[PDB]
RNA sequence: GCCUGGUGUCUUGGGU
């Protein structure tokens, strides 16, 4: 009676970003990202990843509700680089790393066929 | 209005294909009450 | 504080699952020699203090067919009772539980020890576990 | 009231392995055997078919109402 | 008109109910309504 | 620069060993093979008539449990995003079953087997209830007796397991590493002594035990991860494992796309 | 009923004045009453129905 | 073409 379609995990509104950054002007260089539709599978491959980079110096994320599938990712560079242009870096890097992962798992997989 | 209270398919959106009633058809916006969970839907017209 | 979490994928598989049955019963009453409650679909022009539901999932004999999944205040047996001294008769028609919704099971018609007419409409429904549950070792 | 299609904890299938169950008990099989033979290792999915009570079998005796 | 079932024969037969309730077979004196014309539709879940 | 190594394979599962990545990509491929690979499930069922014991959706639940061949899903679409007018031969499967009890003793016994393919997308191999063998009737649905009846035309439809369990294509993920806990990321309860307490991995002459002298190795990450993908059947193990790295690829692809457009 | 309009809380038998504090609404899918933790002391609630 | 009424008194079994 007050359960939510289930689908409205994955399927986004018309009038709803997928994807919002505002900055924290707070502090320098340093921006907020909101991410709609999604959850800790998408969130935590993207953290992790950031992480090791040397000029990222702050990184995280919260889901703030379960019964939501949103969460929120902050994500401060130091001066040099811009935090906008270093996500996409993070994302290029995994992408070509599953690439690579999905070729390796063929070709030994023939082997076994 | 003439199509209150008959059974009614739905051919567009994430309800497609499900059976229902016209139970209040107010303007534009109908309220069908679905057969298939125990809810009762505000949907467009056109669908 | 003594609440718990449950998988989601196993409520989706069918644990803890149940259905759930409710019967309503009506019969007609007696006023006089030939002053009788009749079981009919009531016509809005010939009958007066009609209830605010609809009236259009029952059939001709007064008794909705099963299979017909009903909800809330909709009339699920017609009768009316003649008013003494046309548009004579009045509303006494029983209707679904405002909470309630489900499927007609199945109708038992009959008559009593009296000889009137007796009606039982079995309705069914499926309760699927959800937060604020009841469950216990 | 009928076995289970799928194994409510971790999602195998069990719905096809009764029939398979209830003929390995008359040739004497222990019940822990006949579920090592079904290859059913997880005892998330041994509880499904071990402690399944069917009761269909005693609906089916009231003779049909049509 | 209206289907109707007898609960003990199974015979099938209508009523407009100013009939006598009983099965015209058996004379049994419980009677069933069959299923609606309509069809039914469940999501599965 | 990622590895892997197979330790064994068949058709319904395939154990192997992860190596050379991160934690948090194990894990994101563990969750993504159980809840967002694609698979078809029946999702509608028009009971025309049901004359068993068995209530109407009872029955219906049943059949949406019904694992179906979902091989060639990919070039399928999803019904809410298809631009016809109701269901067509793009976006569904129809199935049909029809069974009866023609005499006054015994019992017939209704079997996923009893599934017919009425239509669908020619002639991409999708939508048969699947099968071990060829004489295996398959997953019990009902049973009835002398003059019940059970006919009813079923929608097969294609969709992820977010929204319901049933098109979910693995079922449980095995999956461990570090079997001797040189990372300390576990600390050991016990009674008396912890070694002889605790059970061994079933992996545990797969790497070396810690020398009893060794100093702990405060910059050691895990890098060894090793998972068993069981299937019901749905799809073959092989196709499970690449289209959970595909599908994870467009997600990430997708937000990519968003950041470069939003400027 | 909007996020932040204040509204009175209770839970019966009302033995003392925290019985009854105004809290804050936000709404939320599913059919159950949310409360913080920590405010089940005073009403001497629990979550067992 | 707006308004729109369906009972009571008990008893019993339960919940915190
Ligand atoms: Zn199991
Ligand atoms: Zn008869
Ligand atoms: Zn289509």
Known sequence: ?113 | ?47 | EDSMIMNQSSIDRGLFRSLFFRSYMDQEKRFGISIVEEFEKPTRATTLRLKHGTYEKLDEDGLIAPGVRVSGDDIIIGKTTPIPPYHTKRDASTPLRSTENGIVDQVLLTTNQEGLKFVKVRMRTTKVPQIGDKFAS | ?66 | ?45 | ?263 | ?49
Not at chain 2, 14 to 32: L, P, Q, S, T, W
Not at chain 4, 3 to 32: H, N
Not at chain 6, 102 to 125: C, H
Not at chain 6, 190 to 206: I, L
């Open chain 1, 1 to 113: 009676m007050n359960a939510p379609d289930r689908f409205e995990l994955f399927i986004l509104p018309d009038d709803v970003p997928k994807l919002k950054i505002t900055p924290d002007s707070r502090v320098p260089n340093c921006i907020i990202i909101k991410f709609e539709r999604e959850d800790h599978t998408l969130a935590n491959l993207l953290r992790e990843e950031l992480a090791l980079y040397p000029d990222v110096t702050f990184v995280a994320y919260k889901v703030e509700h379960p019964l939501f599938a949103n969460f929120v990712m902050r994500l401060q560079t130091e001066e040099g680089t811009r935090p906008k242009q270093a996500l996409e870096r993070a994302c290029a890097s995994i992408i070509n790393k599953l690439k690579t992962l999905d070729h390796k798992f063929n070709e030994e997989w023939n082997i076994k066929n």
């Open chain 6, 1 to 263: 620069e990622p590895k892997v190594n197979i330790i064994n394979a068949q058709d319904d599962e395939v154990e192997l060993m992860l190596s050379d990545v991160n934690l948090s990509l194990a894990n994101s491929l563990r969750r993504t093979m159980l809840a967002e690979v694609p698979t078809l499930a029946i999702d509608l069922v028009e009971i025309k008539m049901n004359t068993s014991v068995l209530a109407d959706e009872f029955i219906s639940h049943r059949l949406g449990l019904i694992p179906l061949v979902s091989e060639d899903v990919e070039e399928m679409k999803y019904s809410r995003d298809c631009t016809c007018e109701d269901y067509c031969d793009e976006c569904s499967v129809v199935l049909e079953l029809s069974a009866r009890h023609e005499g006054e003793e015994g019992t017939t016994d209704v079997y996923s087997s009893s599934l017919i393919k009425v239509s669908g997308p020619g002639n991409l191999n999708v939508g048969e209830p699947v099968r071990r063998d060829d004489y295996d009737q398959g997953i019990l649905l009902c049973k009835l007796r002398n003059h019940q009846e059970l006919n009813i035309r079923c929608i097969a439809k294609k969709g992820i397991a977010k929204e319901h369990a049933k098109w979910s294509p693995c079922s449980a993920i095995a999956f461990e590493y570090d079997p001797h806990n040189k990372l300390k990321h576990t600390d050991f309860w016990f009674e008396v002594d912890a070694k002889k307490e605790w059970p061994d991995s079933k992996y545990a002459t797969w790497e070396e035990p810690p020398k009893p002298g060794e100093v702990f190795d405060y910059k050691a990450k895990p890098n060894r991860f090793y998972m068993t993908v069981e299937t019901t059947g749905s799809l073959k193990a092989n196709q499970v494992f690449s289209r959970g790295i595909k599908t994870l690829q467009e997600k990430l692809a997708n937000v990519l796309f968003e950041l470069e457009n939003s400027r």
């Open chain 2, 1 to 47: 209005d003439p199509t209150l209270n008959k059974t009614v398919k739905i051919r567009q959106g994430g309800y497609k294909g499900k059976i229902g009633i016209v139970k209040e058809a107010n303007g534009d916006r109908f309220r069908v009450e679905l057969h298939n969970p125990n809810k009762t839907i505000p949907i467009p017209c056109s669908f």
């Open chain 5, 1 to 45: 008109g209206v289907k109707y079932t007898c609960g003990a024969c199974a015979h099938n037969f209508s009523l407009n109910k100013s009939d006598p309730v009983r099965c015209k077979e058996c004379g049994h004196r419980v009677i069933y309504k069959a299923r609606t014309k309509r069809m039914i539709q469940f999501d599965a879940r």
């Open chain 7, 1 to 49: 009923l909007m996020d932040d309009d204040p509204v009175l809380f209770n839970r019966q038998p009302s033995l003392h004045k925290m019985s009854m504090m105004a809290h804050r609404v936000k709404v939320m899918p599913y059919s159950t009453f949310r409360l913080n933790l920590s405010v089940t002391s005073p009403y001497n609630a629990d979550f067992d129905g």
């Open chain 4, 1 to 66: 009231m009928i076995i289970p299609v799928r194994c409510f904890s971790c999602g195998k299938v069990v719905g096809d392995k009764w029939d398979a169950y209830l003929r390995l008990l008359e040739e004497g099989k222990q019940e822990g055997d006949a579920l090592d033979e079904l290859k059913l290792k997880r005892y998330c999915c041994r509880r499904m078919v071990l402690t399944h009570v069917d009761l269909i079998e005693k609906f089916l005796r009231y003779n049909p109402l049509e």
